[PDB]
């Protein structure tokens, strides 16, 4: 039950120029995380430089995240997105990350029910091509359940349908995203347990399926029940990381410090 | 010469729910008295022949085709394929008799740092320098849109002007509401960018998308928020604007009701000016 910090949680301070990647790694080390989950949106940095940062701060990468359009209808774009996915897997090898998580589509690019219907077999086809490459390199490939309901990978049923058609594919469960999809987060974990190798933890306070809008909350101040998840995870001997995600407006370092105090308290009660 | 168009994006909620298809949006636009639709194109699955058939049935035209394309892609092969995709969108404009294309040239989730923003900008410009001559060769006006996610280097007046002045022939779709998000005065944006503006998106915001100036904003029915459309209309009429004014709505009210309610306000304000 080790914790990892998503670099994506610090995006506000990276966008403002207050933190660079090394600062995020250093901050994760100082806050006691065992790893970072690295969002990779370009290959501008050399692997050498990232490996150096990780050695300096005695940090590891639990998972590399990327947004890739595996729903692309246009053949040449679709093929280049598979190639990009392979390049991300290559980066996981270079950086000693055991896992990749793909968000396999973009919400602004699904503009109708017919688009959603067509996107699903396309995503599945892409993942059947990419997952064997990940396996050959010794990398565990996952998708994430998402929060924009026009993407055909949000509900328990949707993610299960993909997982059951892609040999070897695994799941990063975003516990809070299930709430947006109208699912019970704990039920999602129970139904998808055999595929869940990574988890994102984020909270919401009171657009959903159940028709009620949510705001990002500091962990423990919203509606998500983390202790119940941790209890089941310990019971089931989950061996992946618990990744800290925050998408709100509180200063990102403060959000991590405050939310981690709640999460560690809840885990310690279960242990 | 002030004409209204309906963004198909404004109807996306009912398209996603299966309540409306593209033809329904075209027919709705015709029934509500629009001069055109602005078509969001996210794939080429629709037959060009069938779109043209729909436009003829409903006596409608397409004023502009909108697309999201990642012209900031750092990996060369992806970058080149996104230039080719943009050229294929221009070809679709020819096939559909749309005079204009609007690209949103990057994706907010793919710019994760200030350095990423810095590196994206010359990349986007270089792509647009390749795409714009192709649009010109096909008689298509190419535009970008000023956006609302401030990590993208195309939101402020200064950012959009920097791109436009480096890409010969490039023009602008002014999203008047997005300028408010960027901390600009929407009317001053129009005045400073007037010679480039060939299309406009009209949307409104109410004070409850995070602004530069602090205020929290949510989509508003037009006329119920803070955007002054009459002042814009008065200036465009004064300058003999010949383009379209495109109706954009991003909120939660039923999309057909939002068009009916918002257009009543917009037409009233334009009428007070002419
Ligand atoms: Mn997540
Ligand atoms: Mn717009």
- Chain B closest-CA separation from residue A15 CA (Å): 4
CA-based diameter of chain A, in Å? 52
Dihedral sign of CA atoms A33, A243, A13, A86 in order: positive
Interface test with A, best of B22, B113, B123 (most A CBs within 10 A): B113
CB-side neighbour CA atoms (13 Å) of B5: 27
CB A247 within 8 A of CB A214: no
CB B186 within 8 A of CB B175: no
Residue showing tokens 């020819």: B94
Q: How far is CA B264 from CA A58, B32, B258, in A?
A: 62, 10, 10
CB B124 within 8 A of CB B163: yes
> B204 is written with which tokens?
């409104």
Provide the number of CB pairs (under 8 Å) joining chain A to chain B: 101
Give the whole-angstrom CA distance, residue A193 versus residue A160.
Answer: 11
Give the whole-angstrom CA distance, residue B62 versus residue B96.
Answer: 7
Instruction: Please return the burial class of B139, using the count of CB atoms within 10 Å of its CB with bins 0-12, 13-18 and 19+.
Output: exposed
Report the separation in Å between the CA atom of B173 and the middle of ligand 2, taken as the mean of its atom positions.
Answer: 8
CB B42 within 8 A of CB A110: yes
Give the whole-angstrom CA distance, residue B47 versus residue B53.
Answer: 10
Cβ–Cβ contacts within 10 Å for residue B199, how many? 25
Cβ–Cβ contacts within 10 Å for residue A100, how many? 27
* Radius of gyration of chain B measured on its C-alpha atoms: 18
Q: How far is CA B267 from CA A40, A268, B29, B180, B273, in A?
A: 47, 62, 15, 22, 10
Residues 6 or more apart whose CB falls under 8 angstroms from that of A160 comprise A191, A192
Mark yes or no for CB contact A106/B111 under 8 Å.
Answer: no
Q: Please, which contacts does B165-168 make with residues 24 or more away whose CB atoms are closer than 8 Å?
A: B166/B125, B166/B129, B167/B125, B167/B128, B167/B129, B167/B132, B168/B132
| Domains present along chain B, CATH in parentheses | 3-273 (3.20.20.150)
The bound ligand whose nearest atom lies closest to the alpha carbon of B181 is 2
Dihedral sign of CA atoms A130, A131, A135, A141 in order: positive
CA-based diameter of chain B, in Å? 52
Dihedral sign of CA atoms A17, A20, A23, A29 in order: positive
Q: Where does chain A show beta strands of DSSP type E? A: 3-6, 35-39, 61-67, 99-103, 140-144, 170-174, 196-201, 203-205, 215-217, 242-244
Residue in chain B nearest A208 by alpha carbon: B252
Structural resolution in Å: 1.5
CA B47 to chain centre: 23
Strand A196-201 relative to strand A99-103, pairing: unpaired
The bound ligand whose nearest atom lies closest to the alpha carbon of B104 is 2
Give the whole-angstrom CA distance, residue A202 versus residue A176.
Answer: 5
Q: Residue B77: its chain A contacts at CB < 8 A? A: 80, 83
Give the whole-angstrom CA distance, residue A42 versus residue A65.
Answer: 11
Residues 6 or more apart whose CB falls under 8 angstroms from that of A126 comprise A70, A78, A81, A82, A85, A104
Strand B171-175 relative to strand B141-145, pairing: parallel
Give the whole-angstrom CA distance, residue B131 versus residue B33.
Answer: 34
Nearest to B102 by CA among B12, B170, B177: B170
Residue showing tokens 């119920």: B224
Q: Which helix (H) or strand (E) covers residue B118, if one does? A: helix B114-137
| Angle (nearest 5°) at CA B264 between B259 and B268 | 145
């Amino acid at each position: 039950m080790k914790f990892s910090l998503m670099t994506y949680s610090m995006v506000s301070l990276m966008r403002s120029g207050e933190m660079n990647l090394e600062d995020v790694i250093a901050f994760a080390a100082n806050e006691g995380f065992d790893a970072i989950e690295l969002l990779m949106v370009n290959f501008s940095r050399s692997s050498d430089e990232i490996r150096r940062m990780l050695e300096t701060h005695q940090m590891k990468i639990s998972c590399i995240d990327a947004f890739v359009d595996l729903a692309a209808q246009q053949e040449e774009n679709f093929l280049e997105n598979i190639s990009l996915s392979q390049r991300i897997i290559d980066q996981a090898v270079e950086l000693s990350a055991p896992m990749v998580m793909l968000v396999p589509g973009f919400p602004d690019l699904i503009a109708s029910e017919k688009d959603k219907q067509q996107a699903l077999p396309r995503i599945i086809s892409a993942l059947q091509k990419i997952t064997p490459y990940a396996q050959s390199k010794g990398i565990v490939l996952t998708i994430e359940n998402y929060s924009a309901l026009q993407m055909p990978f949000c509900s328990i049923a949707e993610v299960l349908t993909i997982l059951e058609q892609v040999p070897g594919l695994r799941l990063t469960l975003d516990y809070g995203n299930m709430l947006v999809a109208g699912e019970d987060p704990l039920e999602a974990y129970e139904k998808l347990r055999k595929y869940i190798v990574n988890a994102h933890l984020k909270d919401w306070k009171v657009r959903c399926a159940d028709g009620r809008h949510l705001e990002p909350s500091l962990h423990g101040q919203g509606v998500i029940n983390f202790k119940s998840l941790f209890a089941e995870m310990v019971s089931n001997n989950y061996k992946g990381y618990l990744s800290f995600e925050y998408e709100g407006d509180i200063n990102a370092k403060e959000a991590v410090r405050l939310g981690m105090m709640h999460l560690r308290e809840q885990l310690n009660e279960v242990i």
